[PDB]
Amino acid sequence: EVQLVESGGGLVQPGGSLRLSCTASGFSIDSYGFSWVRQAPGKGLEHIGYLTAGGRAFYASWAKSRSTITRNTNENTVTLKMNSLRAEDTAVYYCAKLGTGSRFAIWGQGTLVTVFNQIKGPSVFPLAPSSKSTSGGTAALGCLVKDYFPEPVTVSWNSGALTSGVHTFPAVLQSSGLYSLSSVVTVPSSSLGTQTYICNVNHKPSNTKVDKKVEPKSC
């Protein structure tokens, strides 16, 4: 019943603006104060600003020059606008009643905003199971996901049917300015002749999906 839902996420060019809405259901948005919070990938939480129940907006000093927080009671929303964006503004944006001293606390699910100076779909190469794989033992295989921008890429195996033993590494930023990652899985070596292993790589920023069958390499 009680819920907050962020909308408006997406890709923005540097110098662009973001506009996120936070829609409440189960209560009136004007009966409580709400914060906007963000988290850069792999980093901590940052408070942007807070709109009191009375409708007064207070911003972290760094955000005041380019942020606006408003409320619309007819639509039961709170809204964050931020302009003149830079790469450092890439983050998951949440609306929330933080509940620092009251029982009622509620967060939206979060919406990703990515500030991108470039778009580039990934190249995907097999990490082939070793020919030295131990019979009746365990083999490693995977996919190398190279030279894409911006983050993120998602990787499944066999369309989600293979999850046990999978490690998809966090991406590294190469000296080229492009990201690269690998996703690996360990499987029974006795399966290598019989079981098909396909990595499914998805890069929404470039609307690119790659499915790559990874097989033992030919001698």
Binding site: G33, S35, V37, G44, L45, E46, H47, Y50, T52, R56, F58, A60, S61, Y94, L98, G99, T100, G101, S102, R103, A105, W107, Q109, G110, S123, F125, P126, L127, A128, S130, S131, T138, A140, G142, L144, K146, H167, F169, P170, A171, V172, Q174, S180, L181, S182, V184, T186, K217, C219
Partner: protein, 218 residues
């Protein structure tokens, strides 16, 4: 305005250990008590554990307790459990007639100590397909090990490499509290085809495991 200064930035503790995390407010928080503690596990949203310094939210395990006095606030985990791997944040509120501000601490990454475990090590040559692009990626995998600290050195025809590799590490596992780590060596096609023996040398403590291949050989 208000800041929350959190320490330590990270800690490792054995299951059943008592863990203490502190947060110092840069000035008095609202009514001296508007401080909450949040927990965030990998890939999920922050979850509130404790509010008003010490009020444990319903359904939060009682091994989490909050205390505070003055401008110092403390999160205590009395018997660290495996499911407590997370980053913990304090968040404080400052208020006046013309002020309403919030500040998060930097976060404390809590990792679970476990018994040392040696990695399964794998080396992967570059694919023929990639080589057509002019570049070769050689990948070395250290699977399911502990602790995270490892030295991974690349050798090309017995020559130690420097400056042409990058590492990545997984977050601590939920099943075995291990890590996995990749090291990726990047060479031009020209250089890759100029050499024969490729080796990844993994050192932890007193032991080095080296996995290698000869270019072209099966």
């Amino acid at each position: 305005d208000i800041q929350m200064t959190q320490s330590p930035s990270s800690l490792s503790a054995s299951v059943g250990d008592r863990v203490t995390i502190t947060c110092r407010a840069s000035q008095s928080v609202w009514r001296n008590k508007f401080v909450a503690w949040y927990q965030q596990k990998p890939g999920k949203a922050p979850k509130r554990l404790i509010y008003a310094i010490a009020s444990l939210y319903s359904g939060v395990p009682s091994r989490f307790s909050g205390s505070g006095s003055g401008t110092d606030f403390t999160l205590t985990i009395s018997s660290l459990q495996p499911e407590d791997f997370a980053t913990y944040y304090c968040v404080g509120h400052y208020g006046s007639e013309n002020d309403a501000y919030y500040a998060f601490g930097q976060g404390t990454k809590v990792e679970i100590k476990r018994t040392v475990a040696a990695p399964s090590v794998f080396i992967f040559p570059p694919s023929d397909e990639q080589l057509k692009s002019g570049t070769a990626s050689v990948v070395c995998l250290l699977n399911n090990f502990y602790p995270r600290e490892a030295k991974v050195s690349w050798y090309v025809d017995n020559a130690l490499q420097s400056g042409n590799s990058q590492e990545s590490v997984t977050e601590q596992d939920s099943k075995d509290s291990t890590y996995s780590l990749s090291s990726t060596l990047t060479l031009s096609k020209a250089d890759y085809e100029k050499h024969k023996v490729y080796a990844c040398e993994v050192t932890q403590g007193t032991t080095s495991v080296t996995k290698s291949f000869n270019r072209g050989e099966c």
